[PDB]
Amino acid sequence: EPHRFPPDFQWGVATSSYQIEGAVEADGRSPSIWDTFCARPGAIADGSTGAIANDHYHRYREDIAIMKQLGVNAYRFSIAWPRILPDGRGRVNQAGVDFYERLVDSLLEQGIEPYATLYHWDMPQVQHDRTPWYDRGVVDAFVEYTDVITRRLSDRVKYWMTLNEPWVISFLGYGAGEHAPGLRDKELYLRAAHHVLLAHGKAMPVIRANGNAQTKAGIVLNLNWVNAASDSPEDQAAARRYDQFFNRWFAEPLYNGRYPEELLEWYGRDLVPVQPGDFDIITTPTDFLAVNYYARTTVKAGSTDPMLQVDFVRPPGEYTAMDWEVYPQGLYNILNWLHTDYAPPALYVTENGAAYDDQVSAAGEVDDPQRLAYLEGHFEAAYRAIQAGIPLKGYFVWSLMDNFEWGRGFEKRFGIVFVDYATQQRIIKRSGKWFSQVTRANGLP
Amino acid sequence: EPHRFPPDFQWGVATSSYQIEGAVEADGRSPSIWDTFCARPGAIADGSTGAIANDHYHRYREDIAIMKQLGVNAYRFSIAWPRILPDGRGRVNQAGVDFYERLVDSLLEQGIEPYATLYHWDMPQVQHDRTPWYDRGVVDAFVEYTDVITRRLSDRVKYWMTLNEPWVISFLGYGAGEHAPGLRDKELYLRAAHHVLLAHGKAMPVIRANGNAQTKAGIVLNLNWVNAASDSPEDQAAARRYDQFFNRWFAEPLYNGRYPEELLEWYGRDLVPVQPGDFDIITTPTDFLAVNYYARTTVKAGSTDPMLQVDFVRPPGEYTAMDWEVYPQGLYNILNWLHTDYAPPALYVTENGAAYDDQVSAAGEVDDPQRLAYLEGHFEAAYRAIQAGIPLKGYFVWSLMDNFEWGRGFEKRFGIVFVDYATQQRIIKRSGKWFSQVTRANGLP
Ligand code: NI
Ligand code: NI
Ligand code: NI
Ligand code: NI
């Protein structure tokens, strides 16, 4: 049954720098906000840090060989600002730039297209000391960083992502206190959210300028399918607020030059530090929109989250180890919504995947049928989306291998490749072996 | 009935620091004389250096796991003076000490006994600038280094070797110009030879004092079986001079407090800078004598080596890729000579092995029957020595894996484990798989 994807479809896997690289003091790297945050009691559920991680800084070539086994034609990673500009600004760290040159050279040598994320949450601590995301001066700082690295890599890297998951950077970082730098303030989150958008917009012309005609760039948004727990007006309203908060807070500014009004009013409109011309910057044209999709979230009115006055409900269904509902149809729905409402020239699924408890068998294999079924359903939903004329150009599985899952530490494994953290051994999981077939087939089954 | 070795016999593999570690600039390491010497045109046959080597500095855990596969109960390695005291003297480099602590801890955790060589040719360049081996001040410099590292590791390392192959350090380094520092002078070689012996003697009481009742220490001598090309007086005399030059120059001082007199006269006795009390120092009692044996060397009167007035002959037989004659009987003869003439309380074969051209087969294996046959014959010779009552306590194969073979570069492979230098992949060779059975059987199948 030829459920084949388009002939140039990009099949990849995704990682982020602090999640896999380790080697946190190597070669002039300065501490990121995450290096500092992991020190805080209760911040990381298993008490771990990203100090070693997958040790990908040293093991990249081996990982690239794994990718060859996987059959991917694309690889999404992030570049660590602390390696490039350890003082946050000013002097370029040659050694740091050199790592990414070696990585990109190795990828292209193996026929793997590099998709580079500029910012995936690891701002140098020294830069955050000067300009936290709630401080407008952060925009120029991120742009300087973008300029340095893009000038060095634009000859080899064609696809760039500006910032990964604005909602996470702003809300979790500054609103819920769950991610670095670990603050919890509604105003700080809204300021951070606005400045992330501004940084994305100011960065785009820089990327295009340091590139060539082939250069493509966009932002990466986390989106999930949102449902109301019931038909009650309070629940419909709760769902609508959460949807505006999670899914529309960035998309509407990016495409329509406005924040969702009802949520804006509810917050207090003056808390967003919009200045004249900001929306013109924010709406700067992009080549694509990248989407990170994981789950359906079902909402009712309540007090669990005091800021939005909502509670979360779990419909009967299948759940991952992250307590996230498995809802493959949600991916189709999100792609369709973006395509009908904003009409981006191209879409990419830059992240999709699942965490389940994995064990290594006596045979030395990792049998993960739940994760495989998860991936299968979502790939199917993406295939349906393409058949419906949605311009989905690629799909990147989160993640290549198990890694530091932020506040959950190393306890939640998202990889299609298992990592034994005692020895750094990599074992391709059953889902990974299956994926090796999908990529070569292009794709299902 | 099986040819079984004694129940506590130590089966091991051997390496040296510059040959395997790489990471030449890491963690405060300063350049050794070999880092400088590799820069010299014509010094290394394939134009290589030890800058990366086997990358064992990073890959030690993996290598140790290979050792477990091999079934060894002992591991001989060397410690890099440039890592421990990068300025040659004075400030201890704790990161350097730390690598060796982690290496030893990991070995003991796997039940592998560490046998540590203090000096295996890598003097820090900065120290050599102050005290080359021909300068008597080198003795106190080596003793300082010995003291620092033996204090840090004596609780875990019981077996220590002071200096590896005095003949090489002095003759190849200062007499033939073939090894670092690359000088070619008879006087400089003899001064160096004498100071190495003195460094060995001064070091012993330091190692004993920093240790406990279990501490065992000795020197490591290269010895080969020597034959005269014919019965002519000129050939006998040539063979005698070579024997005295290669085999007796160090052994006679160590055990009898004298240099071989005829060769001494031949050179000019004033060139050896012997001072009163030196022989009392050189003869300080040792726990064992370690032996590195490879070949039979056949000599005739000739002008090829002008210093000794000798030529070398190749008898009909089997030759390795180093152009060294395979003569397993020689190993027994050497051990028997040392046992009868000097009666050391214990003997170890700290090095024995062979270099043959290896290829990786399409099946991904390395089939090396010539290396296997070499090892078998020599192990048999060692078995015979033990049956004759020679107190051989252990046997270390040179080497665990292919490595930087000094002046021959990476082109000569001595390992029972193949290294693909493009990726650092280790493939246990056929000889290695065979050895995996010998260690477990504790004798020859
Ligand atoms: Ni169909
Ligand atoms: Ni027999
Ligand atoms: Ni390193
Ligand atoms: Ni003198």
Largest chain interface and its two residue counts? A-B, 5 and 5 residues
Number of domains of chain A: 1
Task: State Rg of chain A.
Answer: 21 Å
Multimer state? part of a larger assembly
Largest sheet of chain A: 8 strands, parallel, barrel
- The strand line-up of the biggest sheet of chain A is 2-3-4-5-6-8-11-12
Overall shape of chain A: globular
* CATH topology label of chain A: TIM Barrel
The termini of chain A sit apart by 8 Å
> Going by CATH, what is the homologous superfamily of chain A?
Glycosidases
Attached small molecules: nickel (II) ion
The total beta strand count of chain A reads 15
Question: Class by helix and strand content of chain A?
Answer: alpha/beta
User: In percent, how much strand structure appears in the residues of chain A?
Assistant: 15-25%
Family (chains A, B): Belongs to the glycosyl hydrolase 1 family.
GO molecular function (chains A, B): beta-glucosidase activity
Protein name (chains A, B): beta-glucosidase
Catalytic activity (chains A, B): Hydrolysis of terminal, non-reducing beta-D-glucosyl residues with release of beta-D-glucose
Task: Briefly characterize the structure.
Chains A, B: It is an enzyme of class 3 (hydrolase). Chain A is α/β, with parallel strands linked by helices and 445 residues long. Helices cover 41% and strands 17% of the residues of chain A.
